[PDB]
Design a protein around this nucleic acid. Structure first.
Ligand SMILES: [Mg+2]
Length: 343
RNA sequence: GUAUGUCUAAAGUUAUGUGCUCUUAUUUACUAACAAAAUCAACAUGCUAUUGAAC
């Protein structure tokens, strides 16, 4: 059905769920369907992250059983791994593709483009949405695929001429959601309070916790606070933030014992840049440190602001990866309904 | 300078048609005509500034 829908439409929007495995599969499906060869020239897939493009290129090259660069390859800033100019499947950053549109606007070395993780709505992504909407007039033969999340698939479709959505199920577990019955006074203090409750109202085995927080200084004060509560009354408590040195970032992926509980206290890095196994519990504070440019003053502001409904759901879907789970939201339903914007 | 005013008790009918017992003001406290032109006695012996999420 996928490889037929792309035959009968030049543009497709795809809701791929977490357990669809979309990113590795569809690229192979379309190459095997034939476009990627000298018939059409290469496939490109954009990513927003450098490390994503390389990791999925390694995975798909190994699923295709080829040395990376030779038929599956990648091209990112500082690093082009394509052993032939005619490398048939090419994973890239959206910025690299955008750079190439300047030197060849028709992109004639490519038959198909996949915009992966386009729900992240990067500057390069958003630009390429307009650029492709115009360029596909200038090339009927250029096939275009846009990945989407459920908040925006209709919106993406309508922009792209109301062209068809396709929704794939994924192998994802249910997460129970719990709003707080009131606004919290200080979310840091509720976060440690609920962390001890989930940790010790259950016995300490077989279910790890992720806690979302707004920044390093806030986060570092939290570990200190939570260790003491155990010593008053086993638990392993770990940080993650982008400024954290990579050796200490890496150890969070390594295992924990039976009877002991892992708990992870995190920035928005754990929404999307990093993926953790065995988390069954989430605590969401409902705020984030969003950069907004004020053009009148010419001034960036890093504001602790309410998150979006989409972002809340993304935090909620961190539990439910490995097994059924729970998300506790430090805010009300009505604040999610009105005070949080949708996208 | 603790306003002041009015009322009534009248007369019956004026002849016709003792216990108990609190109290360190625990008071429903009351009056304003009186006076108001308040400043010597001030003030310590030497002046400060601080931390961002993520790609
Ligand atoms: Mg007088």
């Amino acid at each position: 059905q996928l490889l037929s829908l792309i035959r009968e439409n030049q543009v497709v929007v795809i809701i791929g769920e977490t357990g669809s495995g979309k990113t590795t599969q569809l690229a192979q499906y379309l190459y095997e369907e034939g476009y990627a060869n000298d018939r059409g020239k290469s496939i490109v897939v954009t990513q927003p992250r450098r490390v994503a493009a390389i990791s999925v290129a390694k995975r798909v090259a190994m699923e295709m059983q080829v040395p990376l660069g030779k038929e599956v390859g990648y091209s990112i800033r500082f690093e082009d791994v394509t052993d032939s100019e005619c490398t048939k499947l090419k994973f890239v950053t959206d910025g690299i593709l955008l750079r190439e549109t300047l030197l060849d606007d028709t992109l004639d070395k490519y038959s198909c483009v996949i915009i992966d993780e386009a729900h992240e709505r990067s500057l390069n992504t958003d630009i390429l949405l307009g650029f492709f909407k115009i360029l596909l007039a200038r090339r009927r033969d250029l096939k275009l695929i846009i990945t989407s999340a459920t908040m925006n698939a209709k919106k993406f479709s309508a922009f792209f001429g109301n062209a068809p959505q396709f929704t794939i199920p994924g192998r994802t577990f249910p997460v129970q959601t719990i709003y707080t019955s009131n606004p919290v006074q200080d979310y840091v203090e509720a976060a440690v309070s609920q962390a001890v409750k989930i940790h010790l109202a259950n016995d300490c085995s077989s279910g790890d916790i992720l806690i979302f927080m707004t920044g390093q200084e806030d986060i570092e004060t939290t570990f200190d606070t939570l260790q003491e509560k155990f010593l008053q009354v086993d638990i392993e408590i770990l940080p993650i933030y982008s400024a954290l040195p990579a050796d200490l970032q890496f150890k969070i992926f390594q295992d924990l014992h039976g009877t002991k509980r892992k708990i992870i206290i995190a920035t928005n890095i754990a929404e999307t840049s990093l993926t953790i196994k065995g988390i069954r519990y989430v605590i969401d504070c409902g705020y984030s440190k969003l950069k907004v440019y004020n053009p009148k003053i010419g001034l960036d502001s890093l504001v602790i602001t309410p998150i979006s409904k989409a972002n809340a759901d993304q935090r909620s879907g961190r539990a439910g990866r490995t097994a059924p789970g729970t998300a506790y939201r430090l805010y009300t339903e009505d604040t999610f309904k009105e005070d949080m914007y949708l996208q």
